[PDB]
Amino acid sequence: SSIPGPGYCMGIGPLISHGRFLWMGIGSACNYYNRVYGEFMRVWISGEETLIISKSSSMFHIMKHNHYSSRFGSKLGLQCIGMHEKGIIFNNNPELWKTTRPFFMKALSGPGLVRMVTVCAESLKTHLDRLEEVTNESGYVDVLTLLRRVMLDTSNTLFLRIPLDESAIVVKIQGYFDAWQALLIKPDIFFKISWLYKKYEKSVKDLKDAIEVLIAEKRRRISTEEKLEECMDFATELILAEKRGDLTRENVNQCILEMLIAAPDTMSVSLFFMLFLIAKHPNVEEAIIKEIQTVIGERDIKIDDIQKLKVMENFIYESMRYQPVVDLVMRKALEDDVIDGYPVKKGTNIILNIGRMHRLEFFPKPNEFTLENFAKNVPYRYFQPFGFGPRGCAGKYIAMVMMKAILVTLLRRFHVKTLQGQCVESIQKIHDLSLHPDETKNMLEMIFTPRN
Numbered sequence: 046s047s048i049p050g051p052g053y054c055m056g057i058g059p060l061i062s063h064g065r066f067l068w069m070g071i072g073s074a075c076n077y078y079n080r081v082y083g084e085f086m087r088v089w090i091s092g093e094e095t096l097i098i099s100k101s102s103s104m105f106h107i108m109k110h111n112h113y114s115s116r117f118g119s120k121l122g123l124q125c126i127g128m129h130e131k132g133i134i135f136n137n138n139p140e141l142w143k144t145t146r147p148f149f150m151k152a153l154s155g156p157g158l159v160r161m162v163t164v165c166a167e168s169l170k171t172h173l174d175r176l177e178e179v180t181n182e183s184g185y186v187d188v189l190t191l192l193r194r195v196m197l198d199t200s201n202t203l204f205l206r207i208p209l210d211e212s213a214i215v216v217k218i219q220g221y222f223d224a225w226q227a228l229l230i231k232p233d234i235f236f237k238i239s240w241l242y243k244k245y246e247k248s249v250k251d252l253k254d255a256i257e258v259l260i261a262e263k264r265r266r267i268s269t270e271e272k273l274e275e276c277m278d279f280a281t282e283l284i285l286a287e288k289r290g291d292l293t294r295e296n297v298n299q300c301i302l303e304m305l306i307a308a309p310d311t312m313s314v315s316l317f318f319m320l321f322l323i324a325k326h327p328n329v330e331e332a333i334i335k336e337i338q339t340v341i342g343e344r345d346i347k348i349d350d351i352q353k354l355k356v357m358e359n360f361i362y363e364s365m366r367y368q369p370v371v372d373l374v375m376r377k378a379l380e381d382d383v384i385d386g387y388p389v390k391k392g393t394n395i396i397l398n399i400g401r402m403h404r405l406e407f408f409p410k411p412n413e414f415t416l417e418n419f420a421k422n423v424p425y426r427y428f429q430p431f432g433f434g435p436r437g438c439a440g441k442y443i444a445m446v447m448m449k450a451i452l453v454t455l456l457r458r459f460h461v462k463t464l465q466g467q468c469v470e471s472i473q474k475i476h477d478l479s480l481h482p483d484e485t486k487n488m489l490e491m492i493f494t495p496r497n
Protein backbone atom coordinates (compact mmCIF):
# COMPACT_ATOMS: atom_id res chain seq x y z
CA SER A 46 0.00 0.00 0.00
CA SER A 47 1.02 3.62 -0.68
CA ILE A 48 0.85 6.04 2.25
CA PRO A 49 -2.22 8.21 3.17
CA GLY A 50 -1.96 11.90 4.21
CA PRO A 51 -1.95 15.44 2.74
CA GLY A 52 -0.44 16.18 -0.64
CA TYR A 53 3.23 16.95 -1.04
CA CYS A 54 2.39 20.16 -2.93
CA MET A 55 5.95 20.45 -4.31
CA GLY A 56 7.26 21.85 -0.97
CA ILE A 57 4.14 23.45 0.59
CA GLY A 58 2.85 20.11 1.96
CA PRO A 59 5.62 19.95 4.61
CA LEU A 60 5.35 23.62 5.62
CA ILE A 61 1.61 23.39 6.42
CA SER A 62 1.96 20.24 8.57
CA HIS A 63 4.90 21.47 10.67
CA GLY A 64 3.19 24.86 11.05
CA ARG A 65 0.00 23.03 12.07
CA PHE A 66 1.97 21.07 14.72
CA LEU A 67 3.43 24.33 16.01
CA TRP A 68 0.06 26.08 15.81
CA MET A 69 -2.24 23.37 17.20
CA GLY A 70 0.19 21.55 19.51
CA ILE A 71 1.59 18.07 18.87
CA GLY A 72 -1.24 16.07 20.44
CA SER A 73 -4.21 17.94 18.98
CA ALA A 74 -2.47 17.98 15.54
CA CYS A 75 -1.92 14.22 15.71
CA ASN A 76 -5.58 13.77 16.61
CA TYR A 77 -6.56 16.14 13.78
CA TYR A 78 -4.50 14.29 11.18
CA ASN A 79 -5.66 10.85 12.36
CA ARG A 80 -9.33 11.88 12.23
CA VAL A 81 -9.06 13.54 8.77
CA TYR A 82 -6.87 10.86 7.11
CA GLY A 83 -6.44 7.25 8.35
CA GLU A 84 -5.40 5.73 11.65
CA PHE A 85 -2.06 5.23 9.86
CA MET A 86 -0.83 8.27 7.94
CA ARG A 87 2.13 10.46 6.93
CA VAL A 88 3.06 14.06 7.64
CA TRP A 89 6.28 16.16 7.77
CA ILE A 90 8.03 17.73 10.78
CA SER A 91 10.84 19.88 9.48
CA GLY A 92 11.93 17.96 6.37
CA GLU A 93 11.61 14.40 7.58
CA GLU A 94 8.56 12.18 6.97
CA THR A 95 6.77 11.32 10.22
CA LEU A 96 4.11 8.62 10.58
CA ILE A 97 1.25 9.41 12.93
CA ILE A 98 -0.30 6.05 13.83
CA SER A 99 -3.22 4.99 16.08
CA LYS A 100 -3.58 1.31 15.01
CA SER A 101 -2.98 -1.24 17.81
CA SER A 102 -1.10 -3.65 15.53
CA SER A 103 1.39 -1.06 14.30
CA MET A 104 1.83 0.20 17.85
CA PHE A 105 2.59 -3.31 19.06
CA HIS A 106 4.95 -4.03 16.17
CA ILE A 107 6.89 -0.82 16.75
CA MET A 108 7.27 -1.03 20.56
CA LYS A 109 8.06 -4.80 20.36
CA HIS A 110 11.08 -4.57 18.03
CA ASN A 111 14.55 -3.20 18.88
CA HIS A 112 14.90 -1.26 15.58
CA TYR A 113 12.43 1.35 16.89
CA SER A 114 14.33 2.04 20.19
CA SER A 115 14.85 5.76 19.38
CA ARG A 116 12.81 8.93 19.58
CA PHE A 117 13.30 12.15 17.61
CA GLY A 118 13.29 15.94 17.69
CA SER A 119 15.30 19.09 17.07
CA LYS A 120 19.02 18.55 17.66
CA LEU A 121 19.25 22.28 18.51
CA GLY A 122 16.30 21.97 20.91
CA LEU A 123 17.60 18.79 22.53
CA GLN A 124 21.03 20.43 22.91
CA CYS A 125 19.36 23.48 24.41
CA ILE A 126 17.67 21.43 27.18
CA GLY A 127 20.57 18.97 27.65
CA MET A 128 18.92 15.86 26.20
CA HIS A 129 20.91 15.63 22.94
CA GLU A 130 22.71 12.28 23.24
CA LYS A 131 22.88 12.67 27.03
CA GLY A 132 20.05 11.43 29.28
CA ILE A 133 17.76 8.58 28.42
CA ILE A 134 14.33 10.09 27.71
CA PHE A 135 15.29 11.74 24.37
CA ASN A 136 18.75 10.17 24.06
CA ASN A 137 18.52 8.95 20.49
CA ASN A 138 22.09 7.65 20.29
CA PRO A 139 21.49 3.83 20.24
CA GLU A 140 24.71 2.80 22.01
CA LEU A 141 24.81 5.55 24.58
CA TRP A 142 21.10 5.01 25.36
CA LYS A 143 21.76 1.25 25.74
CA THR A 144 24.49 1.83 28.38
CA THR A 145 22.56 4.45 30.36
CA ARG A 146 19.12 2.82 30.56
CA PRO A 147 20.20 -0.06 32.84
CA PHE A 148 20.99 2.47 35.61
CA PHE A 149 17.38 3.68 35.51
CA MET A 150 15.92 0.18 35.26
CA LYS A 151 17.78 -1.06 38.36
CA ALA A 152 16.73 1.92 40.50
CA LEU A 153 13.05 1.68 39.46
CA SER A 154 12.56 -2.01 40.44
CA GLY A 155 13.55 -4.74 42.93
CA PRO A 156 14.23 -3.36 46.44
CA GLY A 157 13.78 0.33 45.46
CA LEU A 158 10.23 -0.26 44.20
CA VAL A 159 9.49 -1.92 47.59
CA ARG A 160 11.06 1.01 49.52
CA MET A 161 9.03 3.37 47.38
CA VAL A 162 5.64 2.32 48.77
CA THR A 163 6.42 3.62 52.31
CA VAL A 164 8.65 6.51 51.15
CA CYS A 165 5.77 7.68 48.97
CA ALA A 166 3.24 7.38 51.82
CA GLU A 167 5.39 9.03 54.53
CA SER A 168 6.08 11.95 52.16
CA LEU A 169 2.41 12.66 51.51
CA LYS A 170 1.61 12.32 55.24
CA THR A 171 4.23 15.01 55.87
CA HIS A 172 2.65 17.29 53.26
CA LEU A 173 -0.94 16.63 54.39
CA ASP A 174 0.03 17.71 57.94
CA ARG A 175 1.39 20.93 56.35
CA LEU A 176 -1.68 21.75 54.19
CA GLU A 177 -1.34 25.45 55.16
CA GLU A 178 1.49 25.64 52.58
CA VAL A 179 -1.02 24.81 49.86
CA THR A 180 -4.54 25.78 51.12
CA ASN A 181 -6.40 29.10 50.48
CA GLU A 182 -8.31 31.28 52.93
CA SER A 183 -11.44 29.84 51.24
CA GLY A 184 -10.12 26.26 51.82
CA TYR A 185 -8.98 25.80 48.20
CA VAL A 186 -5.99 23.40 47.92
CA ASP A 187 -3.50 23.89 45.09
CA VAL A 188 -3.45 20.18 44.30
CA LEU A 189 -1.04 20.46 41.34
CA THR A 190 1.59 22.10 43.59
CA LEU A 191 0.94 19.72 46.50
CA LEU A 192 1.41 16.66 44.29
CA ARG A 193 4.50 18.07 42.59
CA ARG A 194 6.13 18.69 45.95
CA VAL A 195 5.47 15.20 47.34
CA MET A 196 6.51 13.65 43.99
CA LEU A 197 9.80 15.59 44.18
CA ASP A 198 10.45 14.79 47.83
CA THR A 199 9.64 11.18 46.98
CA SER A 200 12.03 11.12 44.00
CA ASN A 201 14.76 12.90 45.94
CA THR A 202 14.69 10.69 49.07
CA LEU A 203 14.77 7.45 46.98
CA PHE A 204 17.24 8.35 44.14
CA LEU A 205 19.52 11.16 45.43
CA ARG A 206 18.70 12.09 49.04
CA ILE A 207 20.20 15.51 49.47
CA PRO A 208 18.21 18.26 51.21
CA LEU A 209 16.74 20.83 48.82
CA ASP A 210 14.19 23.64 48.39
CA GLU A 211 11.04 21.72 47.29
CA SER A 212 9.07 24.85 46.39
CA ALA A 213 11.83 26.43 44.32
CA ILE A 214 12.90 23.24 42.51
CA VAL A 215 9.25 22.41 41.69
CA VAL A 216 8.92 25.80 39.97
CA LYS A 217 12.23 25.27 38.19
CA ILE A 218 11.14 21.81 37.00
CA GLN A 219 7.91 23.29 35.60
CA GLY A 220 10.14 25.83 33.81
CA TYR A 221 12.36 23.09 32.40
CA PHE A 222 9.34 21.13 31.11
CA ASP A 223 7.92 24.22 29.36
CA ALA A 224 11.26 24.65 27.58
CA TRP A 225 11.50 20.98 26.61
CA GLN A 226 7.92 21.13 25.31
CA ALA A 227 8.52 24.43 23.49
CA LEU A 228 11.76 23.53 21.67
CA LEU A 229 11.30 19.81 20.93
CA ILE A 230 10.10 20.28 17.31
CA LYS A 231 10.91 23.93 16.55
CA PRO A 232 12.51 24.38 13.07
CA ASP A 233 16.19 25.32 12.73
CA ILE A 234 15.13 28.84 11.56
CA PHE A 235 13.66 29.47 15.06
CA PHE A 236 17.00 28.96 16.80
CA LYS A 237 18.79 31.72 14.82
CA ILE A 238 16.58 34.60 16.08
CA SER A 239 17.91 34.84 19.67
CA TRP A 240 15.26 36.90 21.51
CA LEU A 241 12.73 34.13 20.65
CA TYR A 242 14.39 31.38 22.79
CA LYS A 243 16.76 32.96 25.41
CA LYS A 244 13.59 32.84 27.56
CA TYR A 245 13.81 29.04 27.59
CA GLU A 246 17.59 28.84 27.78
CA LYS A 247 17.30 30.60 31.19
CA SER A 248 14.69 28.13 32.58
CA VAL A 249 17.06 25.28 31.72
CA LYS A 250 20.05 26.98 33.34
CA ASP A 251 18.02 27.68 36.53
CA LEU A 252 17.21 23.98 36.99
CA LYS A 253 20.59 22.69 35.83
CA ASP A 254 22.45 24.99 38.25
CA ALA A 255 20.17 24.00 41.14
CA ILE A 256 20.80 20.31 40.49
CA GLU A 257 24.60 20.87 40.07
CA VAL A 258 24.65 22.15 43.70
CA LEU A 259 22.92 18.98 44.87
CA ILE A 260 25.07 16.52 42.89
CA ALA A 261 28.10 18.53 44.13
CA GLU A 262 27.05 17.86 47.73
CA LYS A 263 26.25 14.24 46.83
CA ARG A 264 29.79 13.89 45.40
CA ARG A 265 31.47 15.16 48.61
CA ARG A 266 29.45 12.76 50.79
CA ILE A 267 30.48 9.79 48.62
CA SER A 268 34.21 10.65 48.83
CA THR A 269 34.19 10.76 52.68
CA GLU A 270 31.80 7.78 53.11
CA GLU A 271 32.87 4.85 55.32
CA LYS A 272 30.27 2.13 54.52
CA LEU A 273 29.92 2.63 50.75
CA GLU A 274 28.68 -1.02 50.52
CA GLU A 275 25.41 -0.58 52.39
CA CYS A 276 23.78 2.76 51.44
CA MET A 277 23.57 2.59 47.60
CA ASP A 278 21.18 4.61 45.46
CA PHE A 279 20.60 5.71 41.85
CA ALA A 280 22.77 8.84 41.97
CA THR A 281 25.62 6.94 43.66
CA GLU A 282 25.58 4.09 41.09
CA LEU A 283 26.02 6.68 38.34
CA ILE A 284 28.76 8.58 40.17
CA LEU A 285 30.68 5.33 40.79
CA ALA A 286 30.33 4.38 37.09
CA GLU A 287 31.87 7.81 36.24
CA LYS A 288 34.63 7.00 38.78
CA ARG A 289 35.20 3.80 36.82
CA GLY A 290 35.44 4.55 33.09
CA ASP A 291 31.82 3.98 32.26
CA LEU A 292 30.07 7.39 32.20
CA THR A 293 30.62 11.13 31.70
CA ARG A 294 29.98 13.79 34.37
CA GLU A 295 27.71 15.62 31.90
CA ASN A 296 25.67 12.43 31.32
CA VAL A 297 25.55 11.58 35.06
CA ASN A 298 24.32 15.09 35.72
CA GLN A 299 21.50 14.81 33.15
CA CYS A 300 20.43 11.34 34.36
CA ILE A 301 20.09 12.65 37.90
CA LEU A 302 18.11 15.61 36.44
CA GLU A 303 15.89 13.29 34.40
CA MET A 304 15.06 11.03 37.39
CA LEU A 305 14.07 14.04 39.56
CA ILE A 306 11.73 15.64 36.99
CA ALA A 307 10.01 12.42 35.85
CA ALA A 308 7.35 12.02 38.53
CA PRO A 309 6.67 15.75 39.13
CA ASP A 310 6.07 16.07 35.38
CA THR A 311 3.81 13.08 34.94
CA MET A 312 2.55 11.57 38.23
CA SER A 313 1.33 14.91 39.52
CA VAL A 314 -0.88 15.63 36.49
CA SER A 315 -2.11 12.00 36.34
CA LEU A 316 -3.13 11.97 40.00
CA PHE A 317 -4.66 15.41 39.56
CA PHE A 318 -6.95 14.10 36.80
CA MET A 319 -7.58 10.97 38.91
CA LEU A 320 -8.72 13.13 41.86
CA PHE A 321 -11.21 15.09 39.69
CA LEU A 322 -12.65 11.74 38.60
CA ILE A 323 -13.00 10.47 42.18
CA ALA A 324 -14.68 13.79 43.06
CA LYS A 325 -17.37 13.36 40.36
CA HIS A 326 -17.88 9.56 40.56
CA PRO A 327 -19.08 8.70 44.10
CA ASN A 328 -20.07 5.20 42.93
CA VAL A 329 -16.32 4.51 42.41
CA GLU A 330 -15.10 6.52 45.45
CA GLU A 331 -17.17 4.22 47.73
CA ALA A 332 -15.82 1.01 46.14
CA ILE A 333 -12.24 2.29 46.66
CA ILE A 334 -12.89 3.22 50.32
CA LYS A 335 -14.63 -0.12 50.97
CA GLU A 336 -11.56 -1.84 49.50
CA ILE A 337 -9.20 0.25 51.63
CA GLN A 338 -11.30 -0.66 54.73
CA THR A 339 -11.16 -4.40 53.91
CA VAL A 340 -7.58 -4.63 52.73
CA ILE A 341 -5.58 -2.09 54.77
CA GLY A 342 -7.84 -0.91 57.64
CA GLU A 343 -5.80 1.55 59.75
CA ARG A 344 -2.38 -0.03 59.18
CA ASP A 345 0.46 1.78 57.36
CA ILE A 346 0.37 0.68 53.71
CA LYS A 347 2.89 -2.04 52.85
CA ILE A 348 4.15 -3.66 49.62
CA ASP A 349 1.97 -6.77 50.19
CA ASP A 350 -1.18 -4.61 50.11
CA ILE A 351 -0.70 -3.09 46.64
CA GLN A 352 -1.50 -6.29 44.70
CA LYS A 353 -4.75 -6.66 46.71
CA LEU A 354 -5.96 -3.12 45.81
CA LYS A 355 -7.79 -4.37 42.69
CA VAL A 356 -10.58 -1.78 42.37
CA MET A 357 -8.09 1.11 42.67
CA GLU A 358 -5.84 -0.54 40.08
CA ASN A 359 -8.77 -0.60 37.62
CA PHE A 360 -9.56 3.01 38.51
CA ILE A 361 -5.95 4.01 37.84
CA TYR A 362 -5.98 2.14 34.49
CA GLU A 363 -9.39 3.53 33.45
CA SER A 364 -8.31 7.05 34.44
CA MET A 365 -5.17 6.81 32.24
CA ARG A 366 -7.24 5.24 29.45
CA TYR A 367 -10.05 7.80 29.55
CA GLN A 368 -8.10 10.96 30.47
CA PRO A 369 -4.40 10.40 29.76
CA VAL A 370 -1.49 12.68 30.40
CA VAL A 371 1.02 10.86 28.16
CA ASP A 372 -1.28 10.30 25.22
CA LEU A 373 1.40 10.02 22.54
CA VAL A 374 4.85 8.50 22.04
CA MET A 375 7.65 9.57 19.72
CA ARG A 376 9.81 6.91 18.05
CA LYS A 377 12.19 6.56 15.09
CA ALA A 378 12.82 3.71 12.66
CA LEU A 379 16.45 2.48 12.78
CA GLU A 380 16.03 -0.20 10.08
CA ASP A 381 13.70 -0.49 7.06
CA ASP A 382 10.56 -2.63 7.53
CA VAL A 383 7.02 -3.38 6.37
CA ILE A 384 4.52 -2.30 9.03
CA ASP A 385 0.93 -3.58 8.76
CA GLY A 386 0.67 -2.93 4.99
CA TYR A 387 2.98 0.00 4.44
CA PRO A 388 6.74 0.39 3.93
CA VAL A 389 8.67 2.39 6.57
CA LYS A 390 12.17 3.57 5.70
CA LYS A 391 15.08 3.85 8.15
CA GLY A 392 15.10 7.36 9.69
CA THR A 393 11.30 7.71 9.48
CA ASN A 394 9.83 9.41 12.54
CA ILE A 395 6.81 7.90 14.33
CA ILE A 396 4.19 9.35 16.65
CA LEU A 397 2.13 6.60 18.28
CA ASN A 398 -1.20 8.18 19.22
CA ILE A 399 -1.99 5.84 22.13
CA GLY A 400 -4.70 8.18 23.48
CA ARG A 401 -6.81 7.77 20.33
CA MET A 402 -6.05 4.02 20.16
CA HIS A 403 -7.64 3.52 23.59
CA ARG A 404 -10.91 4.88 22.22
CA LEU A 405 -10.96 2.95 18.91
CA GLU A 406 -9.78 -0.58 19.59
CA PHE A 407 -10.68 -2.98 22.40
CA PHE A 408 -12.85 -1.43 25.03
CA PRO A 409 -16.64 -1.87 25.34
CA LYS A 410 -17.52 1.72 26.33
CA PRO A 411 -14.47 3.67 25.04
CA ASN A 412 -15.93 7.20 25.17
CA GLU A 413 -17.19 7.14 28.78
CA PHE A 414 -15.51 6.67 32.17
CA THR A 415 -16.50 3.26 33.63
CA LEU A 416 -14.65 0.43 35.34
CA GLU A 417 -16.75 -1.87 33.10
CA ASN A 418 -13.91 -1.27 30.60
CA PHE A 419 -11.58 -3.21 32.95
CA ALA A 420 -14.03 -5.85 34.26
CA LYS A 421 -12.54 -8.36 31.78
CA ASN A 422 -8.72 -8.75 31.99
CA VAL A 423 -7.34 -6.39 29.27
CA PRO A 424 -4.70 -7.83 26.92
CA TYR A 425 -1.55 -5.68 27.09
CA ARG A 426 -1.51 -5.41 23.32
CA TYR A 427 -4.73 -3.29 23.37
CA PHE A 428 -3.78 -1.01 26.25
CA GLN A 429 -0.34 0.51 26.51
CA PRO A 430 -0.54 3.50 28.88
CA PHE A 431 3.16 3.13 29.72
CA GLY A 432 4.43 1.47 26.52
CA PHE A 433 6.40 -1.85 26.65
CA GLY A 434 9.43 -3.58 25.17
CA PRO A 435 13.08 -2.49 25.19
CA ARG A 436 12.18 1.26 25.41
CA GLY A 437 8.90 1.20 27.38
CA CYS A 438 8.48 3.41 30.44
CA ALA A 439 11.30 2.69 32.88
CA GLY A 440 8.97 3.73 35.68
CA LYS A 441 5.97 1.64 34.58
CA TYR A 442 5.93 -0.76 37.54
CA ILE A 443 6.95 1.64 40.31
CA ALA A 444 4.56 4.30 38.94
CA MET A 445 1.60 2.03 39.66
CA VAL A 446 2.99 1.40 43.15
CA MET A 447 3.44 5.16 43.73
CA MET A 448 -0.07 6.10 42.50
CA LYS A 449 -1.70 3.51 44.81
CA ALA A 450 0.34 4.69 47.76
CA ILE A 451 -0.71 8.34 47.38
CA LEU A 452 -4.38 7.60 46.51
CA VAL A 453 -4.66 5.30 49.54
CA THR A 454 -3.03 7.71 52.02
CA LEU A 455 -5.02 10.74 50.76
CA LEU A 456 -8.51 9.18 50.32
CA ARG A 457 -8.06 7.32 53.64
CA ARG A 458 -7.90 10.78 55.25
CA PHE A 459 -9.95 13.17 53.03
CA HIS A 460 -13.06 13.53 50.91
CA VAL A 461 -12.09 15.45 47.73
CA LYS A 462 -14.49 17.98 46.24
CA THR A 463 -14.19 19.98 43.02
CA LEU A 464 -15.16 23.71 42.65
CA GLN A 465 -18.35 24.58 40.71
CA GLY A 466 -19.49 21.82 38.31
CA GLN A 467 -15.88 21.34 37.17
CA CYS A 468 -14.69 17.94 35.91
CA VAL A 469 -11.84 16.60 33.76
CA GLU A 470 -14.09 17.07 30.72
CA SER A 471 -14.74 20.77 31.52
CA ILE A 472 -11.12 21.69 32.49
CA GLN A 473 -9.34 23.63 29.78
CA LYS A 474 -6.40 21.47 28.67
CA ILE A 475 -3.27 22.09 26.61
CA HIS A 476 -2.52 19.23 24.24
CA ASP A 477 1.08 19.61 23.05
CA LEU A 478 3.92 17.28 24.28
CA SER A 479 1.75 15.89 27.08
CA LEU A 480 -1.94 16.46 27.88
CA HIS A 481 -2.33 18.67 30.97
CA PRO A 482 -4.40 21.46 32.57
CA ASP A 483 -3.98 24.97 31.14
CA GLU A 484 -2.64 26.52 34.36
CA THR A 485 -3.14 30.11 33.14
CA LYS A 486 -6.84 29.40 33.71
CA ASN A 487 -8.19 28.83 37.27
CA MET A 488 -10.93 26.75 39.04
CA LEU A 489 -8.19 24.04 39.19
CA GLU A 490 -8.19 23.97 43.00
CA MET A 491 -9.95 21.37 45.17
CA ILE A 492 -11.36 21.12 48.71
CA PHE A 493 -10.20 18.51 51.23
CA THR A 494 -12.73 17.76 53.97
CA PRO A 495 -11.89 15.00 56.54
CA ARG A 496 -13.49 11.59 57.14
CA ASN A 497 -15.36 10.73 60.40
Ligand code: HEM
Pocket residue numbers: 108133134135146149153304307308311312315365370371373374375430431432433436437438439440441444
Ligand atom coordinates in the same frame (compact mmCIF):
# COMPACT_ATOMS: atom_id res chain seq x y z
C1 HEM B 1 1.57 8.03 35.46
C2 HEM B 1 2.89 7.93 35.29
C3 HEM B 1 3.62 7.67 34.02
C4 HEM B 1 3.22 7.46 32.71
C5 HEM B 1 1.83 7.41 32.12
C6 HEM B 1 4.40 7.27 31.93
C7 HEM B 1 4.39 7.00 30.56
C8 HEM B 1 5.52 6.84 29.78
C9 HEM B 1 5.52 6.56 28.40
C10 HEM B 1 4.34 6.35 27.48
C11 HEM B 1 6.81 6.51 27.99
C12 HEM B 1 7.26 6.22 26.58
C13 HEM B 1 7.68 4.74 26.52
C14 HEM B 1 7.75 4.26 25.09
O1 HEM B 1 8.28 4.96 24.20
O2 HEM B 1 7.31 3.14 24.78
C15 HEM B 1 7.62 6.76 29.12
C16 HEM B 1 8.98 6.80 29.09
C17 HEM B 1 9.72 6.97 30.25
N1 HEM B 1 9.25 7.09 31.51
FE1 HEM B 1 7.44 7.19 32.08
N2 HEM B 1 5.46 7.34 32.71
C18 HEM B 1 5.10 7.60 33.97
C19 HEM B 1 5.91 7.75 35.10
C20 HEM B 1 7.28 7.68 35.13
C21 HEM B 1 8.08 7.78 36.28
C22 HEM B 1 7.57 7.95 37.70
C23 HEM B 1 9.42 7.67 35.87
C24 HEM B 1 10.69 7.72 36.66
C25 HEM B 1 10.79 7.92 37.98
C26 HEM B 1 9.37 7.51 34.45
C27 HEM B 1 10.44 7.39 33.64
C28 HEM B 1 10.35 7.23 32.27
C29 HEM B 1 11.58 7.15 31.48
C30 HEM B 1 13.00 7.23 31.98
C31 HEM B 1 11.20 6.98 30.22
C32 HEM B 1 12.11 6.88 29.02
C33 HEM B 1 12.49 5.44 28.67
C34 HEM B 1 13.44 5.45 27.49
O3 HEM B 1 13.32 6.28 26.55
O4 HEM B 1 14.34 4.59 27.44
N3 HEM B 1 8.07 7.51 34.04
N4 HEM B 1 6.81 6.94 30.22
Ligand SMILES: C[C@]12CC[C@H]3[C@@H](CCC4=CC(=O)CC[C@@]43C)[C@@H]1CC[C@@H]2O
Pocket residue numbers: 116134306307308310311371373374375376478479
Ligand atom coordinates in the same frame (compact mmCIF):
# COMPACT_ATOMS: atom_id res chain seq x y z
C1 LIG C 1 6.38 9.50 25.76
C2 LIG C 1 7.46 10.57 25.62
C3 LIG C 1 8.72 10.15 26.36
C4 LIG C 1 8.51 10.15 27.87
C5 LIG C 1 7.99 11.50 28.40
C6 LIG C 1 6.76 11.98 27.62
C7 LIG C 1 6.42 13.41 27.99
C8 LIG C 1 6.17 13.53 29.49
C9 LIG C 1 7.33 12.95 30.27
C10 LIG C 1 7.89 13.69 31.23
C11 LIG C 1 8.93 13.13 32.12
O1 LIG C 1 9.54 13.85 32.89
C12 LIG C 1 9.28 11.67 32.04
C13 LIG C 1 9.11 11.18 30.61
C14 LIG C 1 7.78 11.54 29.93
C15 LIG C 1 6.73 10.55 30.42
C16 LIG C 1 7.06 11.93 26.13
C17 LIG C 1 5.99 12.37 25.13
C18 LIG C 1 6.51 11.84 23.79
C19 LIG C 1 7.68 10.92 24.15
O2 LIG C 1 7.83 9.80 23.28
